[PDB]
Enzyme design. Structure first.
Site, PDB file in Angstrom:
ATOM      1  N   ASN B   8       0.862  -1.178   0.000  1.00  0.00           N
ATOM      2  CA  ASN B   8       0.000   0.000   0.000  1.00  0.00           C
ATOM      3  C   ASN B   8       0.902   1.232   0.000  1.00  0.00           C
ATOM      4  O   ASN B   8       1.472   1.601   1.030  1.00  0.00           O
ATOM      5  CB  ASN B   8      -0.946  -0.044   1.198  1.00  0.00           C
ATOM      6  CG  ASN B   8      -1.571   1.299   1.517  1.00  0.00           C
ATOM      7  OD1 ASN B   8      -1.795   2.124   0.633  1.00  0.00           O
ATOM      8  ND2 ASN B   8      -1.880   1.514   2.789  1.00  0.00           N
ATOM      9  N   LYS B  10       0.075   4.257  -0.226  1.00  0.00           N
ATOM     10  CA  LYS B  10      -0.579   5.354   0.486  1.00  0.00           C
ATOM     11  C   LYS B  10      -0.458   6.658  -0.293  1.00  0.00           C
ATOM     12  O   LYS B  10      -0.122   6.646  -1.481  1.00  0.00           O
ATOM     13  CB  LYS B  10      -0.001   5.495   1.898  1.00  0.00           C
ATOM     14  CG  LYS B  10      -0.236   4.265   2.759  1.00  0.00           C
ATOM     15  CD  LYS B  10       0.302   4.430   4.168  1.00  0.00           C
ATOM     16  CE  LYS B  10       0.102   3.158   4.981  1.00  0.00           C
ATOM     17  NZ  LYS B  10       0.675   3.243   6.354  1.00  0.00           N
ATOM     18  N   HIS B  93      -8.866   0.878   6.105  1.00  0.00           N
ATOM     19  CA  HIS B  93      -7.528   1.074   6.640  1.00  0.00           C
ATOM     20  C   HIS B  93      -7.594   1.942   7.891  1.00  0.00           C
ATOM     21  O   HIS B  93      -8.457   2.813   8.026  1.00  0.00           O
ATOM     22  CB  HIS B  93      -6.628   1.714   5.581  1.00  0.00           C
ATOM     23  CG  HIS B  93      -5.187   1.786   5.975  1.00  0.00           C
ATOM     24  ND1 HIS B  93      -4.691   2.759   6.816  1.00  0.00           N
ATOM     25  CD2 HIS B  93      -4.134   0.999   5.648  1.00  0.00           C
ATOM     26  CE1 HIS B  93      -3.394   2.569   6.988  1.00  0.00           C
ATOM     27  NE2 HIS B  93      -3.032   1.508   6.290  1.00  0.00           N
ATOM     28  N   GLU B  95      -5.983   4.360   8.925  1.00  0.00           N
ATOM     29  CA  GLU B  95      -5.960   5.796   8.683  1.00  0.00           C
ATOM     30  C   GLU B  95      -7.306   6.299   8.179  1.00  0.00           C
ATOM     31  O   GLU B  95      -7.692   7.435   8.479  1.00  0.00           O
ATOM     32  CB  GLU B  95      -4.848   6.133   7.690  1.00  0.00           C
ATOM     33  CG  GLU B  95      -3.455   5.983   8.278  1.00  0.00           C
ATOM     34  CD  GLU B  95      -2.411   5.668   7.232  1.00  0.00           C
ATOM     35  OE1 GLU B  95      -2.742   5.714   6.029  1.00  0.00           O
ATOM     36  OE2 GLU B  95      -1.260   5.370   7.611  1.00  0.00           O
ATOM     37  N   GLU B 163      -3.967  -4.980  11.495  1.00  0.00           N
ATOM     38  CA  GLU B 163      -3.136  -3.777  11.504  1.00  0.00           C
ATOM     39  C   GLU B 163      -3.170  -3.129  12.880  1.00  0.00           C
ATOM     40  O   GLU B 163      -4.101  -2.368  13.194  1.00  0.00           O
ATOM     41  CB  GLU B 163      -3.588  -2.782  10.438  1.00  0.00           C
ATOM     42  CG  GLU B 163      -3.247  -3.185   9.026  1.00  0.00           C
ATOM     43  CD  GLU B 163      -3.275  -2.009   8.082  1.00  0.00           C
ATOM     44  OE1 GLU B 163      -4.382  -1.521   7.773  1.00  0.00           O
ATOM     45  OE2 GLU B 163      -2.189  -1.572   7.648  1.00  0.00           O
ATOM     46  N   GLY B 169       3.221   3.655  11.553  1.00  0.00           N
ATOM     47  CA  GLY B 169       4.345   4.542  11.300  1.00  0.00           C
ATOM     48  C   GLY B 169       5.230   4.760  12.508  1.00  0.00           C
ATOM     49  O   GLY B 169       6.349   5.265  12.367  1.00  0.00           O
ATOM     50  N   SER B 209       4.678  -2.566  10.893  1.00  0.00           N
ATOM     51  CA  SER B 209       5.870  -1.958  10.303  1.00  0.00           C
ATOM     52  C   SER B 209       6.759  -3.026   9.662  1.00  0.00           C
ATOM     53  O   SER B 209       7.928  -3.202  10.001  1.00  0.00           O
ATOM     54  CB  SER B 209       6.630  -1.139  11.340  1.00  0.00           C
ATOM     55  OG  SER B 209       5.744  -0.410  12.165  1.00  0.00           O
TER      56      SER B 209
END
Lengths: 253, 252
Positions: B8, B10, B93, B95, B163, B169, B209
């Site tokens: 991904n 992003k 996702h 985010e 996830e 991040g 990660s």
């Protein structure tokens, strides 16, 4: 001076055959000299419309852009990714995002100032709803939607201010010429106070109601209507070309 | 099993980088019998599809609209993606859930709508740092996985990606045992509600990660069928290394 601005927001629509068909139709139409005409296909089709729409007659646009730069933001397309890709315009603040995604004025204003500094031109959209029109709140509703833009935007050279009345966006009751002009006259002499009549008389205050081939005639005659934001008719080829011709003497060659 | 390695990108890309990454992705070799999927942002899906290797990679959309076509400024529909050639789409996702407020039911609705439109879904789940510090972990996944089981009526074309938000991040990696504990819960919880016939065939990939360093250690764990790669997916050399983390988990 205000080169007539006809914006054709396709919205979340189109197949492979339809976009290629609409490209052929838009390419076959003849646009009068001296009119900014911008189509805005959904992200996936931009590479093709960029490559197949006649460069001299139309410029491209994106229907949205992320409030921030790049980084880890899944799904969103950044305002920097667009200018590097070649897109010159972007529609920020549509009533289908202010409502359905909770985009406030301060977000849309910050969404615009970030896109301006990224090298883009913004078709900043405003407008009230049926809830607000009846309550007479149109005085406050736009002044609060506009102040955020004034609070953020620092160079209006590349800004096009679209007035989309939501009580007239998807419902087919196009705001009558005398209605959509009394509001445009406000925004003109309102941008004269905050900015200064030099900037206001140059700014393009287009109209984003339910425009068609028929009713653009009587709207384009009004004084403070410098163009159109077309949604449904923009998906039909010659239907868009007709509205791109309703400019008349407002088209600086 | 067919080891599923997602990538991904992003909100990242330029005309040079996206092109450069396809040359780096076309360069490396992928084990014979591995599902590898990259997901560039919308504007580059055309180039990648016409330049990335057909026989070694598949494409994916980073998001799709909850409804079909119609007056929806900005968004892309699930119908607009299948006719375009895209076979996959990442929905829900972490985010998307936090920033844009994609509700637990919207993500489930987005998954069944995109499935009925001819696509396949990399379904995303996970918990925050607020949700591990309070021990709400197993409650969160049960709620996020239930809503799916509600909407989704065929898990053939669904890859379930775990996830951990605390491990995105931030750089923290859910250690091979931390991410095997969760991957084992989700399987016995899919045998729970869909039977062991569905659960054993289902692909549950880890989405933290992941990098070429720690991909070797997560790929050996029992209930880890692959990876969602976010950051290491932007280096063509490092991503192809992670696609080789499969080993026997893929074979032909």
């Amino acid at each position: 001076s205000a080169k007539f601005f006809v914006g054709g927001n396709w919205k979340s629509n189109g197949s492979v055959a339809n976009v290629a068909k609409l490209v052929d139709e838009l390419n076959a139409g003849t646009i009068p000299r001296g009119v900014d005409v911008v189509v805005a296909p959904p992200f996936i089709y931009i590479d093709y419309v960029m490559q197949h729409l006649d460069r001299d007659k139309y410029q491209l646009s994106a229907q949205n852009a992320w409030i921030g730069g790049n980084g880890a933001f899944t799904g969103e397309v950044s305002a920097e990714q667009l200018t590097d890709f070649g897109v010159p315009w972007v529609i920020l603040g549509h009533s289908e995002r202010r409502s359905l995604f909770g985009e406030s004025n301060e977000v849309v204003a910050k969404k615009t100032s970030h896109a301006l500094a990224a090298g883009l031109g913004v078709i900043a959209c405003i407008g009230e709803t049926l809830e607000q029109r009846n309550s007479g709140s149109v005085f406050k509703v736009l002044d609060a939607q506009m102040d955020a833009l004034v609070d953020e935007v620092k160079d209006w050279t590349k800004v096009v201010l679209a007035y989309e009345p939501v009580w007239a966006i998807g419902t087919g009751v196009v705001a009558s010429p005398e209605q959509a002009q009394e509001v445009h006259a406000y925004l003109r002499q309102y941008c004269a106070k905050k900015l200064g009549a030099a900037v206001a008389d140059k700014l393009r205050i287009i109209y984003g109601g339910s425009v068609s081939d028929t009713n653009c005639k009587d709207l384009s005659k009004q004084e403070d209507i410098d163009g159109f934001l077309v949604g449904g008719a923009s998906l039909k080829g010659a239907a868009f070309v007709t509205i791109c011709n309703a400019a008349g003497p407002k088209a600086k060659p």
